[PDB]
Structures are given as C-alpha cells and as structure tokens.
Amino acid sequence: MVEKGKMVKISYDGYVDGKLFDTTNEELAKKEGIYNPAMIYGPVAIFAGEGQVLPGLDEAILEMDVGEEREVVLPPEKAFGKRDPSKIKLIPLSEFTKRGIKPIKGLTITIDGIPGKIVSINSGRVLVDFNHELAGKEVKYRIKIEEVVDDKKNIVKEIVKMYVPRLSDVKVTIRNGTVKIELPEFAPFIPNIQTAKMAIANEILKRLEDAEKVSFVETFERK
C-alpha cells in the first residue's frame, strides 16, 4: 500500500519501442550503449507518490509493497504526455536569427525555457515542434522498491544527498520542529551551496511533518 509521503528507494528499468532508454544499473548502461556522464545510478530515493517520478510509476509505487517488482505498462497520457497540437507552432525567421542560429531542419532550438525541434524550413517561416521526445509513445517500465526509509534523521540525510551528491555524510540533530544539519568542513566551498541549502530546506519542511526550522552549521578552521 505504501502511504503517501514515505521515502522509498525505488529502482527503474525503462523501455520504449523495445529499446531500453532509462535505468539505474550502471553495468547495464554499458551493456545497452547509453550512459549519462552526469546522472547518478543505484536506487533513486524518491517520495511516495508525491509526483516525484512519472505519474504512472507514481500510482504503481502506491499499489506496490516493499520488495515487490512488476512490468508496469504506461499510456502516453499517464507517462510523458499526449502530443499537443498547439505545441506545434510556426515561428518566424527573425526570432530565429535573433538567437544567433540559422534555421536547420533537424536541429533543435529553445524559445523561452521550452526547447523544441525544427521540422521544416518553409521559405520564410519555420515550423517548430515543442513536444518531449518520448511524448505519444508508450513506455514499458520495470520498477522495484529496493527499500523504504521512515526515520526522520535518516530521511533528512537522503534529501541532502538528493541535492548535493558530494554530501554523503552529515550530522542531523532533531530537537522538535528543528533539524540541525552539521556539514563537513569543505561544504561552504561547494559552488552554489547557499542555493542548495535553501532548497534542501524546502524539501525537509515540505515533507517531514515534525519540522518547522532547518539549520546549517558551517565551520572554518585554519591550517
């Protein structure tokens, strides 16, 4: 059943048109010929049906129990999205050169956060499609609940890691409505750390109910 909000270490196998596209197995990543030089592998810690992952796996994680695995089939409606017509627009040649780009069929461009694909350069105006690569297609998914965590101190720690990979270890210290985080002496030097902290905060609050204050204690010592 897995209540809404309880942290789960899930692990996913993602197929589309038979070919595998997304997963958490690095050894399987080589053996399929796809690898992200940025993504972190192993059981991805997510929250119970809080809309963290795809809505289809989201409802499926709810149905599932700790340890249980299945071949979940996700319709495009409940997976990546049904291909919106209005998301196919014809953007002029100006708004194109205005971004230092010659319109090239196939080449993809971004307008206002939303990226998109040049379909055909119609002498004058350009046809661009703003739908996700995997929109409309149906995904065969294989998800397993690797473990569940339900002890505040630890939950916090996982969040911290979910946001800053480099932060494998930290002292948490719950004192009723407060969550003390004592970060390693290298922490204050992480590029864009304050941002993280103030995001790490959000989540700790947004999820952990017996928490109304988050604290980051940084230390400096001389050599």
Place this chain on the structure above:
Amino acid sequence: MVEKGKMVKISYDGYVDGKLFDTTNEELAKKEGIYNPAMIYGPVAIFAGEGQVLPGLDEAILEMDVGEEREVVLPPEKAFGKRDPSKIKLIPLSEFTKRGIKPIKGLTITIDGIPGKIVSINSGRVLVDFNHELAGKEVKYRIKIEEVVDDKKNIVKEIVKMYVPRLSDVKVTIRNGTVKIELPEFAPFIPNIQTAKMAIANEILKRLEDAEKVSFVETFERK
C-alpha cells in the same frame, strides 16, 4: 600605550594641501563638498597597529591612549608612499587598444590590477604613471580614539559588521576555541555571503587568540 591587537574605534580627520580629503563625519562631508555614496561613516573599528590603517596613524594609535586626540603629521614615506620611478612606464599602443580604449591624456587606465594615469600620448608609445593620487604629498591628520573594545563576544560582532554592514546584530557564543555565530534569517540570502563568512572567519582567528574554530548557523523557516 594601547597593546598591539586590541580593537579600537578610531575616528579620523584627513587634510592634504590644506583641503580635507578623508573623514568619518557625515555632517562634515557635506560641509566640505566630498562624499562617497558607498563609504560608511562614524568611528571606524580597527585593530591596534596591525597595519589596518596608514602606518603613520598606526604608530600614532600605539602612542595614544583611549580618549586622546592629536594633530599627527605624516611624511609621504610613512603615509601613502614615496613616488617610485620604475612605476613610471611607457606602455605601447597595442596593449592599449587591446583593452578597448583610445589613449587619452588625463584619462586613467588599469593594467594588471594596478590602475594608472596616462600622462602624454607620445605618437606611438604612451607614458603612464602608476602611483597613488596622494603619493609624495604629506598629510595632516587628526585622529581620536573614540573607544576601545576588549571583550571577545563583542569583538567578534564588530568584525562581522566590518565585513557585512547589513549584519548589525548576531548571537555570538564562545565555547573555548570556538565562536558560534547565529545569523539573522535573512543572512543566507545576502549576495556573496559564503565569501564574507569565510573571510569573517579568517579575521576572528587571525586576531582573537582563544579561538580555533568559527561557526555559521543559518536557519530557514516557511511562511
């Protein structure tokens, strides 16, 4: 006598060629026709002869005692600097256009941190002088020791302020070799804060002897 290292709230009147050039009196700033839209006025907290201010006032603060004032006269050797010949160099026209600037007599330019003044555009090469405006001249100074602070908790606080004006209030909490700084809830949002903190640290250590660890405790709460 004022021992080396004890924090002092000094206040300065600075004359050069009769005209007043530097001071801590905002009301006198208008009444003389010079004002920095950035500088903060009132007794500037500095450390006892640690080379914080001009070496001349530095040795004079040592001679002086709390409350005492004088008309200290500073030679260019012990004030701003004696005008170095080698600091007058002839930089080529390339290194000039290479910085998007047409060489103009009077206009000042910077090369490698060190700013300097275009003296004469000698058809081909440019004569540039890299000496501080007030170098060579002699300064008439009027300095008064407004107060002295010698209690750790408080000393810390002044440093914090010396670095981040916005931080008028903070909880310090000395626990033997450690200095706990508890910063207001807006602190983590100050632009370039980590930098400050890690600088604030330095000083706290560099000065306060019974301190080997500095700590910054930031907090986040939701609205």
